[PDB]
Write a protein that binds this ligand. Sequence first.
Ligand SMILES: Nc1nc2c(ncn2[C@@H]2O[C@H](COP(=O)(O)OP(=O)(O)NP(=O)(O)O)[C@@H](O)[C@H]2O)c(=O)[nH]1
Ligand SMILES: [Mg+2]
Length: 175
Amino acid sequence: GPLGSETYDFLFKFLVIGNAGTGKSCLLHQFIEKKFKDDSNHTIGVEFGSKIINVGGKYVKLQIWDTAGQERFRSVTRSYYRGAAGALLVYDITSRETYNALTNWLTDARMLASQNIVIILCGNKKDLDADREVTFLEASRFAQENELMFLETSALTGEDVEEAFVQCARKILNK
Ligand SMILES: Nc1nc2c(ncn2[C@@H]2O[C@H](COP(=O)(O)OP(=O)(O)NP(=O)(O)O)[C@@H](O)[C@H]2O)c(=O)[nH]1
Ligand SMILES: [Mg+2]
């Protein structure tokens, strides 16, 4: 994967944000490696990944900053919002607390990045439907009201992970 071997037309800076334990790191690992990370522990500060996707015939390299959700890491994660084109905003459909935090994540994102940062809302862990605390309906209405894209995902199965990243990039390229 050296510099001279890659082909891309666009370079986008993305970040993944949301409460601790929502599955942000598993989402990135799923996207890059097409595997469910085993024994995922809390991210210490931040981690990084990149992947080139095909969006409408153009190749887009996504530089992805997987930020720690724990409040102790707030100060070291400020940097990754600045000049970011898009963000996956993640909550856990089994934890209402993670959903209730979205307004604050959203507000901080739009203040630190440009107000027009493209945000896709990811209701993660949808494979755990027996433990669901947040309905699809209320989340979709929250997204509509706050001009966010929205889908539910499973980092465990892989379902909708690729689509979340791709649709975020798609919206950036085209009005
Ligand atoms: N069943 C299920 N478990 C998931 C899913 N995504 C993540 N998990 C699990 O949920 C826990 C947290 O995942 P993790 O990616 O580490 O969360 P995080 O948002 O990165 N946490 P932090 O902000 O502290 O780094 C782990 O035990 C992980 O295996 C999912 O889609 N389904
Ligand atoms: Mg993490």
